Structures are given as C-alpha cells and as structure tokens.
Design a protein around this ligand. Structure first.
Ligand SMILES: OC[C@H]1O[C@@H](O[C@H]2[C@H](O)[C@@H](O)[C@H](O)O[C@@H]2CO)[C@H](O)[C@@H](O)[C@@H]1O
Ligand SMILES: [Ca+2]
Ligand code: NA
Ligand code: NA
Length: 635
C-alpha cells in the first residue's frame, strides 16, 4: 500500500526531527551526520554543507506532500538563508568588484606542496558577462548563493567575522589542488581577520603575493544550489496537487529559488573566464559567453578585501566539470517553469542552453557498459596547458575529457554515488517530459546498475561502490554522435551505502514510471526499486534511522603528515600548531576528546579497520523520502 510506504517515511521523518537523535545543531540547522567522527568531504560530522541544506529542503518538501503542512518547508528555507547564505555584513565589499577584471590568475598544482601559488598579474582574465546585470536586477552587488561548508558547533573556534563564538561558523578547507585530499587541508575561516594562522592568517598557505590583506570569501557547491531549485519545482507541483496556492503555502520562496538559480549561472563559466578551448594561460580571456560551458562546474567563488586600502573583489567560475553535478531538472525549471524563471535578461536562455548541453554531456560520457564517465576540463593541469596528445581528440565544446575531474585522492571518477545522484535526475526528466535522450541514457544505465547489484543470502544486498575506468569517449559531435566503444567501466568494489542505495531506488522508480507512461514497462527496474527499499527496511533499522556498518581503513590517515611550507608558522584557534610537522589530527586535537577516536586508535592498534554505523543527514533523508517517492509514483 501507499499508506505503508508513507508510514515508513513518516517514521523516518520523526526520527530525524526527534531532538534525542541529534540530527540538528543548537541553531536548528542539519549536521552532516549525527556522529562527530567522520572524514570524507567535510572533516567533522558536526560540520554542515550546502548539500545537507538542500536535502533539508527535500525532506520538508516531502513532509508537505504527505501531510499538507508546508510550514516545515518554510522553516527550512529560512534556516538556509539565516545560516548559509552570507548576509550583507558578511559579504561587505562586493562594491569593489569589477566584472571587466573579475580576478587574478594563479596556477593550480599537481600536489599541495605546489602551494602557495603565485598570483600572476600579467595573465589575462576574461570578462564576467552576468554580474553587472544580476546587480541591476536585485539592487545589490551581493551574491545570493549558498557557501558550501559550515562549522555548526564552532568546533574550530572561528565563529563569524573573526569573533571566535558565533554559529554556524563559515569555514573552508580545500584550496590546494587535485592531490589535496580531505586529509591534507588546513581548515580556515571564510572571514580572514589574521586573528589565527600566521601573521597574515591562513592566506600564505594558498596564494603568494607581495601584500596580504584581510578579506572574506565564499565557495559555492553548484550541485547543492541546483538541488535546492529542483526541490522547489517539485514542491510547487505538490502544493498545486493539493489544490493549495504556493503563494500562501511557501510565500516568497519560488522568487528566492529563481534568484539563487540566477546567481548559480556563475558556475557556468571558466574559472578565469578564459575562452573554451584555451591551451595557453597567456591567452587573452573571453568576452561575453566565449568562456561559458553552460554546465554545473565544481564551484563558483567570490570574495573581497576587508577595506578600501586594498579595494579589490573577485569572482571565479570553475574550469572542471563533473557529470555528477549536472541537473536537467533545475535547468528545465529555471528555463521553462514561469514561477522559477529568473528575472535577469539572458538567464532563461542560459539555462535552456544548459539543459541541452547537460544532456549532450551525459551522452558524450556514457561508457560502452552504461555508466557515465567523469567529465571534462577547460584547464589542463589547472594551467591551461595543451591538451595531451593521447586525449587531444576527446573533446566537448573545447574542453577535454577528464576521467577524474577536480580531485585524484581518491579519484572523483571512482565513486559510484555520482552515478545515482545525477542519473536520478535524468530519470526524473524522462518521467516529466518523456524525453527521448533521457530515455536512451536510462535504457543503458539502468541495466548496468541492475546487473551489478548482488542480492545476498539473508535478503540483503550490496550495491556497486567503487569504479575503475579505462579509455576515452569519442570526439563529441551533436549532429552525428558516435558510440563510445572504447570507454569502459568496471565495478571493482561493492558495499551497503544506504544513501546511495536509496538514490538508486529513486532513479529506478522514476525510470520505471516514465517507461510505463511513455514506452514499454520496465518491471525489473520497478521491482528492484521496491526490493532495495524493502531490504533496507527489514535489515538496517537503527534507533536513529537506517544504517549499515562500514569499514573505514582510511582513518589511518588521521596520523598522516600534512604539507605546510617551511616559511609558514601558524596556530589553529585552540592553539594547535600549523607547521611542517603538522598531521591531520595534530591540527584537529579536539578529536582526542571524541569517544569514537579511542575506537579508531584501538582498531588501528590491533591491525584492524575501524567500523562505524553512520546516520548522514543526506542519506537518512534520501532513504526516508524514497518510500514516499515510491508511494507517490505507484499508489
Ligand atoms: O564527495 C562526495 C560525497 O561523499 C560522501 O561520502 C562518501 C565517501 O565519498 C565515500 O568514500 C564513502 O565510502 O561513502 C561516503 C558516503 O556516501 C559525503 O557523505 C557527501 O557529503 C559528499 O558530497
Ligand atoms: Ca534594480
Ligand atoms: Na544569512
Ligand atoms: Na593526496
């Protein structure tokens, strides 16, 4: 029944919202995870992410759907704005920004030891063709987008605006290229007041310059902003399905969603607004949209000098594009659905171009077997180097194929989770529009997944976890696309990642629903969806939601040394040292007081991998909502 699956969702929703289970901080924002000791993208479980906020929106949107009560969604959007979108006071100097000269170039490097990277004021940067028009639209130079990373409990001691106290605290980590794993960062405040770090705060870890100024900067995760917009598209439909009025149920939120998708266009540009196909850092930069790829790149970022003695601000897009970030639902909403169309002239056209280009990108990256390959870069080696001869033909509108876009430790192509996150969105598009390109993609992707799930003796399962890639796609040709017969993927590891299992279930259910509506039924997809969901319910119940144990041998890296320059002498807020003998743990010695830490040490001291059972907000939300989703589609 529908009512049973809806009850499973409600039970989960109740668990997530019961304060005894610890999903939310003192300020009412989701944590990454209930458990504090966890290292993967954030480096503590009581960090939070724009991803978590986007999932908080999803959770409360389904609660609306099921119950008629939209107040939870109103609350979630308000918490997002309050916590994770910098107020004017927190982004105080966007008036310094010059869209004709958006930033100054620094190379990326193949190891963190490459950093700090020299700012090269003789290297041309292209024009930003959107910021001035966004500022005119909204009456403000400020950016309305989520920063990616918060410290919810002030565990690093930065507070906000240099205050050492306020929560959620804006922080950042990753800054030192493709080999800077989550283990190798130095966690630093978004507001750089030179209070901590060295004499010039944390800045000289990252960029070399003659002068260092106090400053603020934020870094967007486009996949999370895109997800927020996707959720609101669905929320609108669900409200209308109840015969209610979105302007009474979620007043102002569609307009704020369309604003966020307006600024999210910054993700569609090369890092330094270089022309597509740029293969020399010295090349004159783009004008207008010459530097647009129209996809959801790895980030956009913006920042500004604290004061007029310095008097600068910057914006950058990203030159790395991973398939796992794309979102045809957000692009279709922002280009076609009136209540979410952004107001800045051009913005509906860019998103229409984005929607098309993203469907070409999934097609271009589809392996012989069905999995989607990593993505592409407009900056080979993060220095606009020449495209290597061994992949020189493998291009997509000027960008070259990259099997592991952005990061290599571990490879960003190797995680199966991206398959599920991004293909769910294609499956939704197939469902919504009966789109032929989406159908063809999913016809090839769905059975590759199904073929690689192992059903276990006890009724449980293992899904694909880790991937290995060989080869390259053919040169993209939208007029005559070639079969990528020399791009291959193998599944080399399986696991019980229930967040990813739920995302597979959802991709499968939308694919099956779409097929029944528009083509021939795909009963195996539908049954596999249901089996996953039922096997999770009957094998992985916990007091806090649905979770499976996981081995984390990677936690040996707590004790790894981290690159810090010889000239750099710094302190963390708790007085931990930042120097050339620092390790991940020695700069995060609060972990010594965490109960789970003793368990890591004891396990590693016994020659064993530690084992944890995690309740990640995004996963518990994905699992909870997958029950509601199935009931909505099939009952
Ligand atoms: O960076 C992508 C994504 O990773 C999530 O953690 C993964 C981790 O990358 C994978 O190695 C581990 O085996 O499974 C976990 C859980 O799926 C992290 O939870 C996300 O926040 C992050 O966006
Ligand atoms: Ca105006
Ligand atoms: Na805010
Ligand atoms: Na590394």
């Amino acid at each position: 029944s529908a009512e049973e699956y809806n009850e499973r969702f409600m039970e989960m929703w109740n668990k997530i919202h019961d304060p005894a289970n610890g999903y939310f901080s003192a300020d009412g924002g989701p944590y990454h995870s209930v458990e504090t000791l966890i290292v993967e993208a954030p480096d503590h479980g009581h960090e939070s992410t724009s991803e978590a906020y986007s999932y908080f929106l999803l959770l409360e949107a389904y609660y609306g759907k099921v119950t008629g009560d939209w107040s939870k969604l109103r609350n979630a959007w308000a918490k997002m704005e309050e916590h994770i979108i910098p107020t004017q006071e927190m982004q105080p100097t966007n008036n310094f920004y010059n869209p004709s000269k958006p930033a100054s170039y620094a190379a990326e490097h193949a190891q963190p030891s490459g950093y700090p990277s020299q700012l090269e004021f003789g290297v041309p940067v292209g024009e930003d063709p959107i910021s001035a028009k966004l500022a005119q639209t909204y009456g403000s130079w400020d950016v309305y987008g989520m920063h990616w990373l918060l410290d919810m409990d002030n565990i690093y001691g930065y507070g906000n605006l240099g205050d050492g106290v306020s929560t959620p605290s804006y922080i950042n980590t990753f800054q030192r290229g493709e080999q800077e794993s989550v283990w190798e960062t130095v966690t630093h405040p978004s507001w750089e007041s030179f209070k901590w770090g060295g004499p010039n705060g944390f800045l000289p870890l990252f960029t070399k310059d003659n002068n260092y100024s106090r400053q603020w900067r934020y870094t967007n995760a486009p996949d999370a902003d895109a997800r927020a917009v996707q959720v609101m598209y669905w929320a609108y439909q669900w409200i209308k399905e109840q015969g209610k009025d979105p302007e009474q149920e979620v007043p102002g939120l569609m307009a704020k969603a369309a604003k966020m998708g307006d600024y999210l266009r910054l993700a569609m540009f090369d890092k330094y607004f270089k022309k597509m196909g740029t293969q020399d850092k010295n090349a004159q930069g783009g004008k207008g949209y010459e530097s647009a790829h129209y996809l959801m790149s790895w980030y956009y970022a913006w920042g500004g000098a604290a004061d007029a003695n310095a008097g600068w601000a910057f914006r950058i897009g990203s030159s790395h594009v991973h398939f796992g970030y794309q979102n045809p639902i957000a692009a279709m909403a922002l280009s076609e659905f009136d209540p979410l169309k952004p107001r800045t002239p051009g913005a509906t056209e860019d998103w229409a171009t984005g929607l098309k280009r993203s469907m070409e990108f999934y097609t271009w990256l589809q392996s012989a077997e069905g999995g989607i390959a990593g993505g592409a870069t407009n900056s080979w080696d993060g220095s606009y180097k020449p495209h290597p001869q061994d992949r020189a033909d493998a291009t997509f509108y000027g960008m070259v194929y990259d099997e592991n876009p952005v990061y290599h430790d571990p490879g960003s192509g190797t995680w199966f989770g991206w398959q599920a996150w991004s293909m769910q969105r294609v499956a939704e598009y197939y469902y919504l529009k009966g789109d032929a390109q989406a159908k063809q993609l999913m016809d090839k992707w769905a059975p590759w997944v199904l073929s690689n799930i192992n059903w276990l003796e006890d009724g449980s399962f293992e899904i694909p976890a880790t991937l290995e890639w060989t080869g390259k796609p053919e040169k993209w040709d939208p007029a005559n696309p070639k079969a990528n017969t020399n791009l291959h993927v193998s599944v080399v590891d399986h696991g019980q990642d229930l967040g990813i299992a739920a995302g597979v279930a959802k991709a499968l259910m939308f694919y099956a629903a779409a097929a029944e509506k528009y083509d021939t039924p795909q009963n195996e997809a539908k049954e596999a969806s249901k089996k996953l969901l039922d096997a999770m319910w009957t094998h992985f119940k916990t007091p806090k939601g649905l979770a499976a144990p996981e081995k984390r041998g990677d936690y040996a890296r707590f004790f790894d040394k981290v690159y810090v320059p010889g000239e750099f002498n710094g302190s963390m807020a708790n007085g931990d040292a930042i120097n050339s003998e620092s390790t991940f743990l020695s700069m995060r010695s609060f972990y010594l007081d965490d109960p789970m830490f003793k368990q890591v040490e004891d396990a590693l001291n016994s020659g064993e991998d530690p084992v944890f059972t995690y309740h990640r907000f995004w996963a518990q939300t994905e699992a909870a909502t997958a029950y509601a989703n199935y009931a909505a589609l099939f009952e």
